Amino acid sequence: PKGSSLGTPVNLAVLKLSEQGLLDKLKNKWWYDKGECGAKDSGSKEKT
Amino acid sequence: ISPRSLSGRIVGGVWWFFTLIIISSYTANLAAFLTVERMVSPIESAEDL
């Protein structure tokens, strides 16, 4: 909300989590780690 | 290649047709890759890199 105490601290915390890698780590955790399709691209064999 | 054999004729007939199809497919595929120049991209992914 405009004029809230959490605005700037959250604005900084988002950057802190992105630069630390926790945001991408959570992305991979909830997209690929828990993903049903485990084989992904590492085992597709890259048919050529 | 020995005299006349009733069985040898069918053996060399099926074999001749088989090797004919094989060489025809070889020439066809060779023309297919001398005509279709499709740039293959190697190791796009970072993990395989």
Does residue A5 sit in helix, strand or coil? coil
Instruction: Please name the residue of chain A whose CA is at the shortest distance from the CA of residue B39.
Output: A48
Residue B32 neighbours by CB under 8 Å, 6+ apart: none
Which method was used? Answer: X-ray
**Quick check: A41 and B40 CB within 8 A?**
no
In whole angstroms, what is the distance from residue B27 CA to residue B4 CA? Answer: 32
Instruction: Choose among A41, A42, A48: nearest Cβ to B40.
Output: A48
Torsion-angle region of residue A45: left (phi > 0), alpha (psi -120 to 50) or beta? left
Give the experimental resolution in Å.
Answer: 4.7
Instruction: Please name the residue of chain A whose CA is at the shortest distance from the CA of residue B43.
Output: A46
In whole angstroms, what is the distance from residue A13 CA to residue B32 CA? Answer: 57
For residue A48, list chain B residues with Cβ-Cβ distance below 8 A: 40
